[PDB]
Design a protein around this ligand. Structure first.
Ligand SMILES: *[C@@H]1O[C@H](CO)[C@@H](O)[C@H](O)[C@H]1NC(C)=O
Ligand SMILES: [Ca+2]
Ligand SMILES: [Cl-]
Ligand code: NA
Ligand code: NA
Ligand code: NA
Length: 496
């Protein structure tokens, strides 16, 4: 469960948030495969409630109506087509599994669903599954509202409704089986793993029981005995009885402390600075590296909607963001996931974004295709961070140095730091208000290297900064605090 099952040598997955299956299929073949991306986290592929007030918000996909693979991203055939094409070029598919609940208990009954399936939240009926009142936690939940009211009580957190979302009775074999039927279908079709949505809201033992029902990965694309990759969403910042470590027996866990702290250090909040990153990882109270699914931001907290506070860096903070993503992709801690977003009319009032509900780019509710501009960026308001040179090249950097140890660390006691990965890569950052010019021990073989942040290695030459490593492994680096990208990265494959 702990291994991502990526093709040998690919170390990251990208969240193609709200992308349609056809666009992802094309992206796997045209970009993800040749660029060394390990896989794609897709938005919930199962039928959800079609919410028109507000107009088709992104969060309506976390309110299940049935397990039919029929959503705004595409139908069942378009989904399989995507998984097949991606696997065929060595790019995996990870499904965002919303199995803790169905839709909000107050949503009106009817067929306002992405596949037209009828459902009645009030009578607890979801015939397409089918689920009835017997399959929810109404009787089990102990709170006066029926919703989660206090996180200091690990029981209600698991048995009561998360913000009114109908809570499935995951202890019942019937429910566990309907969920496993949905997940095994996806596995046999070729999916490599799953993001278990709202895991903090499910008992570690219930998740385990469902996982016991899961098959090994498709034997035509994967080695015999391959278990699906499992990363459970648990936002554990340390002040609750529930700890993300309680879920290690099922797989990895999202380490939300990662982006929260990387955000405060890079934003230099509360006197924090990059020199403190020397012992980044478990030293910061994070889960063990082999149980961590890391990221700078995720679909929820990039709109302040999730957890990490206002410290979370996003594409809106492009400059600091690329640097945050760069440090993450260079550091050996955890399995990395890069975010890929769409732009929305962010509108702050009294400090809160009133348009944080806005769904993906669309025409009358129909999600827009991802258009690729000549410079390889995306149109139709898709940000495509995974396509930014500075990020895509660090995804490659991670592949190149995989297995190499963290060493040759340096810091000026402030915000100018650097470190290497064995003898295959070196990265330097300058987040101080003054220039950084110094000769550093890179641990790399002598030669000329292309800086992959400011440029690329192309046809035997560099399009950007060039770094010269001497026989003693030393190299001079110069980074202005006013540079477009205040960090430089070189590796075994960017060497001339
Ligand atoms: C690298 O580019 C220069 C021109 O900028 C050219 O003179 C040189 O031959 C190129 N080398 C290779 C190996 O393509
Ligand atoms: Ca629950
Ligand atoms: Cl997540
Ligand atoms: Na493998
Ligand atoms: Na969540
Ligand atoms: Na196993």
């Amino acid at each position: 469960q702990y291994s991502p099952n990526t093709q040998q040598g690919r170390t990251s997955i990208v969240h193609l948030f709200e992308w349609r299956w056809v666009d992802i299929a094309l992206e796997c073949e045209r970009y993800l495969a040749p660029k060394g991306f390990g896989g794609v986290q897709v938005s919930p592929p199962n039928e959800n409630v079609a919410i028109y007030n507000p107009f088709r918000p992104w969060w309506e996909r976390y309110q299940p109506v049935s397990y039919k693979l029929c959503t705004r991203s595409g139908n069942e055939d378009e989904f399989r087509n995507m998984v097949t094409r991606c696997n065929n070029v060595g790019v995996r598919i990870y499904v965002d599994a919303v199995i803790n609940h169905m839709c909000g208990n107050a949503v009106s009954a009817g067929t306002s669903s992405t596949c037209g399936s009828y459902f009645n939240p009030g009578s607890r009926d979801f015939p397409a599954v089918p689920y009835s009142g017997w399959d929810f936690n109404d009787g089990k939940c102990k709170t006066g509202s029926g919703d989660i009211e206090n996180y200091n009580d690990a029981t209600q957190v698991r048995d009561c409704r998360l913000t009114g979302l109908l809570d499935l009775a995951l202890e019942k074999d019937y429910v566990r089986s309907k969920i496993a039927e949905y997940m095994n279908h996806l596995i046999d079709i070729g999916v490599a793993g799953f993001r278990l949505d709202a895991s903090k809201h499910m008992w570690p033992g219930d998740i385990k029981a469902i996982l016991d029902k899961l098959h090994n990965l498709n034997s035509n694309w994967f080695p015999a005995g391959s278990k699906p990759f499992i990363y459970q969403e648990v936002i554990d910042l340390g002040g609750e009885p529930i700890k993300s470590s309680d879920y290690f027996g099922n797989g990895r866990v999202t380490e939300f402390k990662y982006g929260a702290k990387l955000g405060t250090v890079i934003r230099k909040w509360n006197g924090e600075k990059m020199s403190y990153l020397k012992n980044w990882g478990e030293g910061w109270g994070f889960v063990p590296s082999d149980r961590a699914l890391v990221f700078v931001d995720n679909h929820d907290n990039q709109r302040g909607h999730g957890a990490g506070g206002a410290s979370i860096l996003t594409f809106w903070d492009a400059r600091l963001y690329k640097m945050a993503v760069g440090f993450m992709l260079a550091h050996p801690y955890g399995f990395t996931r890069v975010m890929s977003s769409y732009r929305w009319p962010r509108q702050f009032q009294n400090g809160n974004d009133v348009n944080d509900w806005v769904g993906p780019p669309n025409n009358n509710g129909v999600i827009k295709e991802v258009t690729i501009n000549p410079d390889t960026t995306c149109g139709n308001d898709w940000v495509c961070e995974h396509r930014w040179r500075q990020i895509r090249n660090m995804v490659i950097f991670r592949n190149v140095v995989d297995g190499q140890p963290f060493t040759n660390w340096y810091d000026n006691g402030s915000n100018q730091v650097a470190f290497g990965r064995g003898n295959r890569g070196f990265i330097v950052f300058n987040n101080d208000d003054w220039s950084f010019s110094l000769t550093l021990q890179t641990g790399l073989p002598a030669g000329t290297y292309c800086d992959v942040i400011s440029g690329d290695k192309i046809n035997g030459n560099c399009t950007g900064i060039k770094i010269y490593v001497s026989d003693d492994g030393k190299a001079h680096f110069s980074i202005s605090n006013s540079a477009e990208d205040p960090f430089i990265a070189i590796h075994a494959e960017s060497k001339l």
